[PDB]
Amino acid sequence: PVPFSHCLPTEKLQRCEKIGEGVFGEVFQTIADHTPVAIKIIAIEGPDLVNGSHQKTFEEILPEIIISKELSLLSGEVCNRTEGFIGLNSVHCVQGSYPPLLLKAWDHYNSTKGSANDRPDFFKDDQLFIVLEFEFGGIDLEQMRTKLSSLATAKSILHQLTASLAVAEASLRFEHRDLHWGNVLLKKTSLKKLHYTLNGKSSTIPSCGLQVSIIDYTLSRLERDGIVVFCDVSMDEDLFTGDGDYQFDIYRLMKKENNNRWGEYHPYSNVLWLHYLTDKMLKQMTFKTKCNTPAMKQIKRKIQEFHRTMLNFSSATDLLCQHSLFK
Numbered sequence: 001p002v003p004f005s006h007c008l009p010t011e012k013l014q015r016c017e018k019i020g021e022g023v024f025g026e027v028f029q030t031i032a033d034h035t036p037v038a039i040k041i042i043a044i045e046g047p048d049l050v051n052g053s054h055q056k057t058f059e060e061i062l063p064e065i066i067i068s069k070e071l072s073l074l075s076g077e078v079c080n081r082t083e084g085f086i087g088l089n090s091v092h093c094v095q096g097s098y099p100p101l102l103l104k105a106w107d108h109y110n111s112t113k114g115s116a117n118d119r120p121d122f123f124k125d126d127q128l129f130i131v132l133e134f135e136f137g138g139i140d141l142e143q144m145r146t147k148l149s150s151l152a153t154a155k156s157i158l159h160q161l162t163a164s165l166a167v168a169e170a171s172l173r174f175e176h177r178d179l180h181w182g183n184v185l186l187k188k189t190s191l192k193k194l195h196y197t198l199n200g201k202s203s204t205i206p207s208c209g210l211q212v213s214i215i216d217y218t219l220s221r222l223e224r225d226g227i228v229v230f231c232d233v234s235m236d237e238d239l240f241t242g243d244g245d246y247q248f249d250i251y252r253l254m255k256k257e258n259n260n261r262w263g264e265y266h267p268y269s270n271v272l273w274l275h276y277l278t279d280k281m282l283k284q285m286t287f288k289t290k291c292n293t294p295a296m297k298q299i300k301r302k303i304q305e306f307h308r309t310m311l312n313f314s315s316a317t318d319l320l321c322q323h324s325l326f327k
């Protein structure tokens with residue numbers, strides 16, 4: 001393992017601002033070579049509860065690391081190519097107590113937004129962490145609930161998500177398995193069209209000024225040459241007992257689809273998550289401009305039709321290739 005200073009030299013550490021969190025740990029934004037990056041920091045291997053949960057072992061965190069790398073590599077592939085995941089710049093195993101400068105950033109977030117996590121000031125100098133440095137992907141869909149222009153934007157977002165998932169199905173037999181709206185990131189782009197390639201066939205998607213990135217592979221699954229990488233949640237209690245959001249139903253619906261066998265490939269789970277995201281677009285997102293005219297009224301009807309028909313498709317690939325929304 002390396003010290004924190006290896007990943008976060010002084011100037012980079014001084015520029016860290018906290019941008020997100022979960023039971024897993026903390027996410028900070030910083031800058032290096034004039035370029036924003038996001039740093040995800042996860043405590044591993046120790047006996048302390050962290051945010052109410054036991055720390056993962058190295059064996060337990062390896063799947064997320066492997067999947068992050070494979071999905072990032074799709075941006076440079078040829079037959080199955082997409083930029084719709086998030087870039088992975090580096091991964092390190094770090095040993096030490098939590099940097100005081102990161103505690104300062106943590107406190108500022110706690111003071112302004114409020115945190116559900118423990119202040120991470122209780123680690124000893126032998127504590128291990130995984131530090132993942134990602135491309136900065138923008139702002140999550142949940143935080144953009146009231147910030148998007150119109151339902152035309154929602155169409156582009158759904159098309160981008162579906163295309164990225166299809167490409168990862170085709171190349172990696174990928175299932176995200178946790179694509180809640182905190183895991184869909186939006187960034188401005190000046191590109192009018194985005195490009196992907198699916199089984200050697202290239203196409204484009206109108207951007208509506210946004211590029212989508214899918215993040216967070218904690219529950220994900222994929223395979224290469226029959227070697228399956230996944231999170232075995234077959235004995236998890238709490239994952240299947242949530243309430244108050246359709247999100248929590250998706251976990252139960254996945255378990256129904258796969259008969260509680262998480263190593264198998266069931267790309268219908270990607271359809272389920274896409275349905276949950278379409279439902280958010282129609283029910284919880286609110287747009288600056290309503291569908292006040294016809295033509296926008298037509299996009300709205302098409303997204304409603306997608307919502308009521310998409311559960312009859314077998315995979316993101318089937319949706320992309322066959323659904324009328326994308327024709």
Ligand SMILES: Nc1ncnc2c1c(F)cn2[C@@H]1O[C@H](CO)[C@@H](O)[C@H]1O
Binds near residue numbers: 019086
């Ligand atoms: N690569 C990234 N770029 C920008 N924001 C990010 C990330 C990332 F990995 C997490 N987050 C944020 O941290 C939260 C928890 O993972 C997410 O919901 C996002 O808000």
